[PDB]
């Protein structure tokens, strides 16, 4: 189990392919609940995400803070990771402990394409965090005019 997580953290293709073809669990995690897909979306290893989704990895990874693979896809700014995960059937309105939707993270992190591709899925523009703020408030805090326009267009 730990070998798969370390190999995914190391960005290894054949190693993880052999490990998950050997019989190891695809959703092995540490006491902090770090799934292999969590690190795959963290470091932008596209082939790792593809292999995990093909072999049937979890789509609703849940760590201590409540982060999801799509949350880190929007946080780090990875192009096709979020696309393949939404093709898997990922939820769009997942709320973590802080209540920060992935759209809020993408807006605050300046990823226009991620915001738009989540918006196509049916993203909730009127989603609120634990403080009652929306993605528009975080965007205007970040001072992004074009992002504010594109978020207000669908609102």
């Amino acid at each position: 189990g730990k070998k798969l997580l370390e190999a995914a953290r190391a960005g290894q293709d054949d190693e993880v392919r052999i490990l998950m073809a050997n019989g190891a669990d695809v959703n092995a995690c540490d006491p902090s609940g770090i799934t292999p897909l969590h690190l795959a979306a963290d470091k932008g290893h596209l082939e790792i995400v593809e292999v995990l989704l093909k072999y049937g990895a979890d789509v609703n990874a849940m760590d201590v803070w409540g982060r999801t693979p799509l949350h880190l896809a929007a946080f780090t700014g990875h192009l096709e990771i979020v696309e393949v995960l939404l093709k898997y059937g990922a939820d769009v309105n997942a709320c973590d402990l802080n209540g920060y939707t992935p759209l809020h993270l993408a807006a605050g992190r300046g990823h226009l394409e991620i915001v738009e591709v989540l918006l196509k899925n049916g993203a909730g523009v009127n989603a609120q965090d634990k403080f009652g703020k929306t993605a528009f408030d975080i965007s205007i805090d970040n001072g992004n005019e074009d992002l504010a326009e594109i978020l207000q267009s669908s609102s």
């Binding site: 803070w65 802080n98 920060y100 993270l105 605050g108």
Partner: protein
């Protein structure tokens, strides 16, 4: 074994300092205690001594 966890500060993961600023990855101090009025053992607090 035989140690005390005394953390009078807040986390920072790898990037965002949180010294008096709203940090999105800095988390926050210890969460409070939900003394529910009348519920099951999941919300029935107990007092213990050693």
């Amino acid at each position: 074994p035989f140690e005390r966890d005394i953390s009078t500060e807040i986390y920072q993961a790898g990037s965002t300092p949180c010294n008096g600023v709203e940090g999105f990855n800095c988390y926050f101090p210890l969460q409070s205690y939900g003394f529910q009025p009348t519920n099951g053992v999941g919300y029935q607090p107990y007092r213990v001594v050693v």
